[PDB]
């Protein structure tokens, strides 16, 4: 189930309970080791789109893994607290 | 004068002090062609001028008849009062000539082997200086009023062109591009000018009385729409009160200068966009086309030379005081350029002659037969 239920979300939380770039941006190291080389490029490319404040199309044909590169950039952005 | 020299060799004053002081003294002493003359090949009025970024030796010019003439601005002769000859001219006989009036021309920064001219024939042409032929031709739907190239950016070769259409066009010399386009304006864009401090920052002035600070990398609209009265902040925030037809960044890029047809001139902070409330008095401006002006560099206090009817006005950039009026022309002047090294001024007007404004107060010592009163006794 999704975290729409506050009680459920808290329950999940309880259950639950570093490369740097030019402009200054760090990723969780315990996650960066879990991807492959090309996924690292996409994360850097995505943050390169963050500096210019422009969008992008990630056209990696299926099977390469689209969610992870979005999540890794998303998780890294939350970790760095830019 | 002598005190400045003595204070330099002694070391009391840093060597820049004499240079800035003597530079600003030359600007104040500006006067007509005491030792110069510009060769006349423009049949019509001259619309634009540009001095090469490096070595400041050759100057382009664009007439109302479409011919573009490249000039030479140093005395290769021993005698004085030399004539500024033209090394080359792209005239009617040229197969790739601007058919109609050429509005603004510009040397490519970082080298003198290429220059771009944009005309009212809806085209921006890339030229080869050595062979005097074109390399890239950029056609446009509407007429072209101005175009600027970034003088400091080294990561790109974008040329920004403002057309009669309500939307900015960004052409890249690298590749063709010609498709990147900035939206947010409503009427004819009369002036575009990049920021000498920030590579990707662009200022666009259009007939909707709005000047917008853009970032080319930015994919979401404009950054600052400059307003006059600094209210709390678009379809509002008018930059001026009429038609903004001028744009000139200061030497360091920290402030912006704009001229409109409201007979008013304003100085604007480059970062936040608040106007600095320098009043400048009344600056006559009835031009319906792009009005080109320049600002002095490397002096004690920066100056701005703006066309003023048939004269050129000199103001202190920050103090906003009227220094002097250079009454030399007979028709309205539309472009003025500043020779940074020698503190000289070149003025293009509609009487088909480029006038040179050179510093005075240096005269030959005799051992004037024409300088006498002939009153009867």
Query: Which resolution in angstroms does this entry have?
Result: 3.4
Phi then psi for A48, rounded to 5 degrees? -60, -35
Residues 279-298 of B with CB under 8 A from A: none
What residue in B sits closest to A52 (Cα-Cα)? B217
Residue among B287, B289, B291, B233 at smallest CA distance from B257 = B291
* Residues preceding chain discontinuities in chain B with C to N over 2.5 Å: 233, 367
Please give the annotated binding residues of A, written as ranges: 60-67
Which residues of chain A does B219 touch, with a Cβ-Cβ cutoff of 8 Å? 52-55
The single-letter DSSP state of residue B195 is -
Structural method: cryo-EM
- Subunit contact A55:B218, Cβ cutoff 8 A: no
All structural domains of chain B, each given as residue ranges with its CATH number in brackets, are 1-361 (2.130.10.10)
Question: What single string gives the DSSP state of each residue in B164-185?
Answer: SSSSEEEEESSS----EEE---
- Subunit contact B217:A55, Cβ cutoff 8 A: no
Residue among B220, B199, B308, B310 at smallest CA distance from B264 = B308
**Helices A67-80 & A37-51 angle (0-180, nearest 10):** 50
Q: Give the largest Cα separation in chain A, rounded.
A: 41
d(CA B160, CA B168): 7
Specify whether the CB–CB gap between B207 and B243 falls below 8 A: yes
d(CA B197, CA B152): 7
Edge-to-edge, what's the strand order for the sheet holding B248-249? B248-249, B255-259, B265-269
d(CA B225, CA B212): 5
């Amino acid at each position: 189930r999704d975290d729409g239920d506050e009680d459920y979300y808290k329950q999940r939380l309880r259950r639950w309970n570093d490369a740097e770039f030019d402009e200054g941006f760090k990723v969780p190291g315990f996650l960066f080791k879990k991807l492959f080389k090309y996924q690292q490029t996409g994360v850097r490319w995505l943050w390169e789109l963050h500096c210019q404040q422009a969008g992008g199309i990630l056209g990696d044909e299926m099977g390469l893994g689209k969610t992870i590169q979005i999540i890794a950039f998303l998780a890294g952005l939350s970790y760095s607290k830019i | 004068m002598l005190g400045f020299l003595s204070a330099r060799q002694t070391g009391l004053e840093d060597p820049l002090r004499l240079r800035r002081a003597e530079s600003t003294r030359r600007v104040l002493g500006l006067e007509l062609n005491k030792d110069r003359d510009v060769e006349r090949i423009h049949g019509g009025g001259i619309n634009t001028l540009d001095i090469e970024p490096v070595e400041g030796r050759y100057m382009l010019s664009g007439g109302s008849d479409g011919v573009i003439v490249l000039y030479d601005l140093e005395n290769s002769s021993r005698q004085s009062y030399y004539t500024c000859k033209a090394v080359c001219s792209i005239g009617r006989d040229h197969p790739d000539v601007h058919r109609y009036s050429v509005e603004t021309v510009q040397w490519y920064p970082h080298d003198t082997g290429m220059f771009t001219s944009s005309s009212f024939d809806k085209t921006l042409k890339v030229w080869d200086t050595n062979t005097l032929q074109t390399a890239d031709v950029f056609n446009f739907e509407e007429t072209v009023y101005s175009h600027h190239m970034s003088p400091v950016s080294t990561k790109h070769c974008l040329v920004a062109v403002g057309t009669r259409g309500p939307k900015v066009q960004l052409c890249d010399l690298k590749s063709g591009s010609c498709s990147h386009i900035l939206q947010g304006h409503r009427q004819e864009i009369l002036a575009v000018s990049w920021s000498p401090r920030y590579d990707y920052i662009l200022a666009t002035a259009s007939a909707d009385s709005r000047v917008k600070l853009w970032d080319v990398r930015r994919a979401s609209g404009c950054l600052i729409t400059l307003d006059q009265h600094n209210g709390k902040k678009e379809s509002a925030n008018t930059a001026h009160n009429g038609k903004v037809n001028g744009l000139c960044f200061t030497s360091d890029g920290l402030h912006l200068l704009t001229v409109g047809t409201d007979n008013r001139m304003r100085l604007w902070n480059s970062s936040n966009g608040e106007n600095t409330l320098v009043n400048y008095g009344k600056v006559c401006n009835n031009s319906k086309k792009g009005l080109k002006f320049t600002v002095s560099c490397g002096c004690s206090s920066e100056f701005v030379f703006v066309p003023y009817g048939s004269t050129i006005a000199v103001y202190t950039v920050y103090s906003g005081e009227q220094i002097t009026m250079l009454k030399g022309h007979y028709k309205t002047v539309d472009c003025c350029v500043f020779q940074s090294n020698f503190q000289e001024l070149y003025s293009g007007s509609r009487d088909c002659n480029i006038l040179a404004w050179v510093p005075s107060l240096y005269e030959p010592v005799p051992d004037n037969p024409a300088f006498e009163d002939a009153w009867s006794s």
